[PDB]
């Protein structure tokens with residue numbers, strides 16, 4: 001009864017604190033928006049919907065982000081009024097256009113080079129913490145380390161004197177309950193009193209800072225910015241922010257790190273991998289954020305009528321975005337319940353939000369997670385979770401257990417046998433991990449050589465444990481002898497078969513070295529560094545009819561799509577053309593599966609597939625999926641550019657790599673509309689490199705126009721396309737753009753970033 005579940009929905013309970021993505025799985029799957037009467041909120045649960053809401057803060061205001069779920073009684077008001085409580089807007093809950101202007105004025109101390117200066121402090125505090133308890137054999141990781149490290153760092157970043165932690169903790173709990181919780185009525189007056197005391201304590205801190213405004217920390221810097229921008233950095237802002245940022249600057253980092261260590265210790269195989277290889281830590285942390293992140297729900301309120309998930313919402317409608325649900329959305333993350341530290345798009349999780357309000361401290365929080373995981377993985381690889389109950393403080397937005405008890409045998413501490421482990425340091429990842437940071441080590445279980453220039457590889461985990469599932473069209477990248485010679489190969493095994501992955505690698509007659517290395521070097525039992533899967537050629541599973549066209553080695557993604565069409569029961573034909581009979585691969589398998597829906601054309605025997613004839617017989621609604629040589633794909637796109645009632649999707653294997661030659665190029669201007677930022681791209685930089693340098697997070701893989709991972713959305717201007725992914729019609733729309741290589745025809749571009 002999905003209508004009953006909506007009626008009863010109530011996040012203030014252990015089940016939603018413990019696993020909010022499971023708690024709303026029914027809605028993510030079947031009811032992507034519902035009204036929750038116990039809250040007076042609309043609840044949304046899918047990744048695409050939540051990302052769009054984040055993109056549009058004019059329509060979807062963050063005004064209710066810090067809003068209490070209580071009354072307030074006149075007694076509560078009166079308690080609050082005694083302290084002059086006037087908490088108003090900070091950054092996270094501020095409306096446009098004021099928000100972006102204040103962010104612009106205040107964001108500089110959050111720059112990479114400043115945040116990297118805190119590394120020594122984080123390392124020293126983590127080392128101190130673990131030294132205290134390393135020999136005990138039992139410890140609560142939260143009260144012994146994970147809470148104090150971000151707390152200490154945060155107050156130092158802020159310039160707040162750190163001398164009364166029991167009072168600060170008391171203050172932080174009350175603020176959090178007040179902002180995100182639902183205290184019962186018999187408890188609200190005590191909460192209100194502590195909130196008032198926190199407000200007045202922040203008044204005192206602020207007044208001491210005003211008289212030392214040249215001292216350190218971000219709050220004194222905001223006071224100095226007030227002198228220059230008094231209408232932007234107000235007294236109301238400064239006082240409200242002081243209270244909110246004392247909590248925000250540590251609590252969520254504590255929670256993320258608590259959740260990460262719990263998830264890692266619950267997956268012994270993965271924990272053992274990290275303990276043998278610290279370079280996995282940036283990718284493992286991102287997937288901990290994706291899989292078990294500290295953000296449950298986040299809020300917005302409509303400022304106009306708007307349709308959402310096919311429902312027309314009135315003005316002022318409250319929306320709860322279940323961010324944890326989005327991070328488990330199978331439409332964006334294949335096999336989302338699989339905890340996969342090789343997951344190549346893990347950093348697309350929404351724990352840091354997206355666009356205008358995107359978390360300013362996120363790379364400091366990442367660094368703290370990484371160094372804490374590192375220290376524990378080096379010194380306590382043999383610890384395990386003790387038996388315990390996990391207790392969660394109820395609130396709608398942030399979730400972690402309050403304690404994390406672990407136990408180990410100190411006589412097995414590896415530093416006793418090898419004390420120089422204490423001198424090792426894994427250099428820290430600033431920002432999300434790059435593609436070459438997200439790598440799985442695989443074993444070549446078998447190698448078949450059906451023809452002189454095709455090798456079929458069967459790839460498994462070295463331990464043969466299960467692999468994540470993928471979806472038709474996905475590819476992996478194999479590092480062909482070095483990390484900077486990575487090549488894409490389409491997965492062509494069964495996407496649900498977790499035992500192994502199959503690829504077929506053609507030896508290229510003019511190899512730049514990649515497929516040549518595979519043909520000269522790969523043998524069963526070898527270990528390969530593999531990235532992905534990533535899917536840039538997804539099958540629309542709701543088409544009425546399919547036409548699948550494979551030219552040569554282009555059969556590899558196409559055959560996974562034809563197998564899927566069969567399983568869905570949709571009408572399809574599979575046409576497979578080769579030059580030499582010896583180049584046929586998988587034909588016996590394909591005949592068994594597809595029967596009389598398979599058509600094979602061997603051109604050395606004089607047989608070819610007349611595409612103009614085959615397309616003019618295609619009926620309206622048909623989706624054509626094709627992979628083959630460049631000339632075959634051009635032909636299909638000329639034929640389809642005059643048949644609007646059929647659609648074409650192509651994947652290019654043989655594009656020409658892009659290469660920036662700055663002598664032939666010009667600077668251009670890019671406006672990031674959602675981030676409220678305008679940057680210049682000089683002649684010697686790609687757009688991708690400039691986005692990274694402004695900490696705009698964009699995923700990339702080949703970085704040379706071939707794989708399409710770096711695509712961004714253009715809303716104004718004319719693109720000078722340099723990639724090999726887009727069709728001509730796509731190029732002419734001036735919407736999609738590969739930022740690793742493409743530039744501008746107009747002087748400026750406007751991006752939806």
Ligand code: HEM
Nearest residue numbers: 091092103249252253351352353354357358359360361365
């Ligand atoms: C480590 C885990 C962290 C998480 C999960 C987290 C979460 C968030 C979220 C969800 C937002 C709102 C995003 C949006 O609406 O688009 C946010 C904003 C913000 N965060 Fe974080 N945060 C973390 C760490 C930090 C740290 C360590 C700091 C400060 C040192 C911090 C400072 C801020 C600020 C100032 C904003 C306001 C940005 C704005 O509205 O323009 N965050 N954070």
Ligand SMILES: Cc1cc2nc3c(=O)[nH]c(=O)nc-3n(C[C@H](O)[C@H](O)[C@H](O)COP(=O)(O)O)c2cc1C
Nearest residue numbers: 487488489490505506508511512513514515556653
């Ligand atoms: C998305 C994508 C999928 C590809 N799939 C395959 C494949 O399944 N088999 C293959 O031989 N080449 C495939 N290629 C081409 C290879 O990635 C690679 O360019 C080719 O092996 C030539 O590399 P080389 O010049 O270094 O030898 C694919 C390319 C792309 C962009």
Ligand code: FES
Nearest residue numbers: 701703708710740
């Ligand atoms: S990263 Fe491969 S196309 Fe840009």
